Symmetry: C2
Subunit: 257 residues, 2 copies
């Protein structure tokens, strides 16, 4: 019996394609002369934002570039400084990226009718979430609970946030819960937490497409990209893979057999 | 691979037989004119002390007698009042009941050598533990971390305290941990948290015997009582059972196969 579902935020319940942090990540590196790609920027998507900045400076390609510019490798000074700008730019546009993804709200309402608790974990800090959650609520979305990396010792891939969701929701064991996310770090979080782990494709950070791009893309090109994402989720721990949230119910019935 | 081991306190690491509260639970009920057996007083051993008093008032036999004497069932005020007396008494004698059980420390140090983190959960309040922990530490025992029901939404059998341990000790998943306890509620906490659950027999609250009573007892009767406890532990979800702590290391090695 699945008594609760723990949802990721960006790229899962709000912000189709997880675009809010994409250009911000590229913007902060572009200034130093180190231009990164959208694919690199998306690699550590899901982790706490500051950990994300560090992970980017850790990447060989980005590190080689940077060192070859400033004549040295990125120091904690360079990370703190970039994350600093990351916040200033993120906070201004943040209200525009809290729109509930197409059919998520009906799924949420369906889960509540059955008495299933609604939890959530995030990559955003508490300060950022006060903005995202308020705005999402205005648009018709509010989970039963929400935990950010600021509430526990560390964010994803650690299972700390999921354990806190269970605690405040009163649901145990962990296998009576489902984690649904859209990034590789979301899958690692669900598994390290010992819960049933589900990956969503359309609207995910891993796909990195806007709704329009999905609606207007050549069917064959789309399916190729969909399977690339499905395989990535699977290789990284996913018990299940769904194209949209509309299949969540089916994964639940399957698990309960 | 087992990364950490969570031990219960009274009855597992310290206070052989778990006598510290025994006579107190009996005292607070006899005063009201409702005599309770030692078996009844020990049945819910492990739960937060206040929850323990409430559990006793919920037991059919105890509830029935109270209804006979007072013409009503126990009131929250009654429980609140009994618990106040439970503290006044328990506090004055706590220090005497905080001494490590014979060979536990040996197993403890042998685990620290194998790079194993030691965590702990209790039924005692934060206030009570200050006393127990200070004294236990004076006699050679001090785990890496300790959690009480005061740190989480509820105590045993809920797995909250164990998740906290996992967070602070930085270990995951839960099955990379072993829960070592001596009560039924200790077994349910281990299973509810999704970890390897092990019951200690000699010196456990379930046995109820002291060291002298154990040694100065017939060899047929003892093995009879040990089997009663062993079956109880197992019947309640325990994966494995050990008579003394010197068998823990074997269970570990066994599991890592
Ligand atoms: Mg996400
Ligand atoms: Mg105990």
């Amino acid at each position: 019996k699945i008594e609760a579902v723990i949802f990721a935020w960006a790229g899962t319940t709000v912000d189709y394609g997880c675009f809010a942090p994409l250009e911000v990540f590229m913007e902060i590196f572009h200034k130093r002369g180190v231009a990164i790609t959208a694919e690199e920027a998306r690699k550590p998507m899901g982790l706490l934002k500051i950990d994300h900045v560090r992970a980017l400076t850790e990447m060989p390609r980005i590190a080689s570039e940077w060192n070859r510019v400033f004549r040295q490798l990125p120091t904690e000074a360079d990370i703190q400084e970039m994350y600093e700008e990351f916040e200033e730019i993120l906070f201004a546009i943040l209200p525009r990226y809290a729109s509930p993804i197409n059919g998520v709200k009906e799924v949420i309402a369906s889960l509540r009718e059955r008495g299933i608790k609604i939890g959530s974990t995030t990559g955003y800090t508490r300060e950022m979430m006060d903005i995202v959650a308020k705005e999402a609520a205005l648009q018709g979305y509010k989970p039963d609970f929400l935990v950010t990396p600021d509430d526990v010792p560390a964010g994803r891939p650690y299972p700390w946030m999921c354990y806190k969701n269970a605690m405040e929701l009163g649901v145990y064991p962990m296998n009576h819960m489902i984690k649904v996310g859209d990034t590789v770090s979301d899958m690692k979080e669900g598994r390290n937490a010992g819960m049933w782990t589900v990956g969503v494709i359309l609207g995910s950070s891993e796909l990195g497409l806007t709704e329009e791009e999905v609606e207007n893309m050549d069917s064959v090109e789309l399916r190729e990209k969909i399977e690339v994402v499905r395989n990535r989720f699977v290789e990284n721990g996913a018990h299940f893979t769904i194209e949209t949230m509309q299949e969540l119910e089916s994964v639940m019935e399957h698990i309960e057999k």
